[PDB]
């Protein structure tokens, strides 16, 4: 028994759709520090025309900058952020902007796929695979927004 | 006590983005930071203080 704005968490994506979303997100893992460093060293050695890279967006400030621009297509939100005020308004912002959002249990689990110890949120803007993203978005909507 | 709250504002989707400052050119151009890092690595290689990974593979012997 808490205010409606609270307890919107504890209702989350089911195991199957959550696993599917994690599998889809793992494809766009950003180049870790070691991989980027070695690739840059290789490029410099070769020097001693380029496609736009694709990666997931996870910075809370960066994600919020992408959110409200309607560029973000799907956003994942951790339900165990200690400063809950950082994420209480994010679902409402996404709903107002019409951007589908999914609450996934575990900030550590969210961060494990972006080479970070923890990550409050994760969002996707570009895609490689658009049909898979659309199907995942539809499934997430039908299983989360229409239910809760 | 915890009465339901009405989504009197979120019930209508935002038609247009709120932000401004149209897209910078860098978003449509390869990053300049990458070029700076590549040129720094090139300078280091010229100074002989960085070994290319291909040469590192040979030195692994």
């Amino acid at each position: 028994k808490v205010p409606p704005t609270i307890a919107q968490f504890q209702y989350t994506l089911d195991r199957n759709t959550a696993a599917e979303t994690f599998k889809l997100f793992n494809k766009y893992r950003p180049e870790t520090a070691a991989e980027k460093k070695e690739r840059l060293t290789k490029e410099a050695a070769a020097v001693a025309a380029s496609p736009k890279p694709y990666a997931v967006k996870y910075g809370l400030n960066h994600v919020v900058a992408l959110i409200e621009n309607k560029k973000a297509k799907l956003v994942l939100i951790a339900n165990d952020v200690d400063p809950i005020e950082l994420v209480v308004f994010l679902p409402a912002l996404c709903k107002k902007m019409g951007v589908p959002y999914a609450i996934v249990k575990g900030k550590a689990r969210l961060g494990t796929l972006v080479n970070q110890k923890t990550s409050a949120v994760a969002a996707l803007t570009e895609v490689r695979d658009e049909a898979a993203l659309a199907k995942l978005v539809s499934t997430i909507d039908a299983n989360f927004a229409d239910k809760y | 006590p915890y009465e339901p709250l009405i989504d009197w504002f979120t019930r209508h989707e935002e038609v247009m983005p709120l932000t401004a400052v149209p897209e910078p050119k860098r978003r449509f151009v390869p990053s300049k930071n990458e070029a700076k890092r590549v040129m720094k690595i090139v300078r280091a290689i010229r100074e002989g203080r960085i070994i290319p990974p291909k040469k590192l593979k040979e030195m692994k012997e």
């Binding site: 704005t5 409200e68 209480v88 409402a92 912002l93 | 989504d7 504002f9 979120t10 709120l18 401004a20």
Partner: peptide
């Protein structure tokens, strides 16, 4: 600023009414 007004309205809807405001 339109963005500031939008943020204020969003916060108003999220926070609901204060206990003293609820008296109205």
């Amino acid at each position: 600023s339109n963005r500031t007004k939008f943020v204020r309205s969003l916060v108003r809807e999220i926070a609901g009414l204060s206990p003293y405001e609820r008296r109205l």
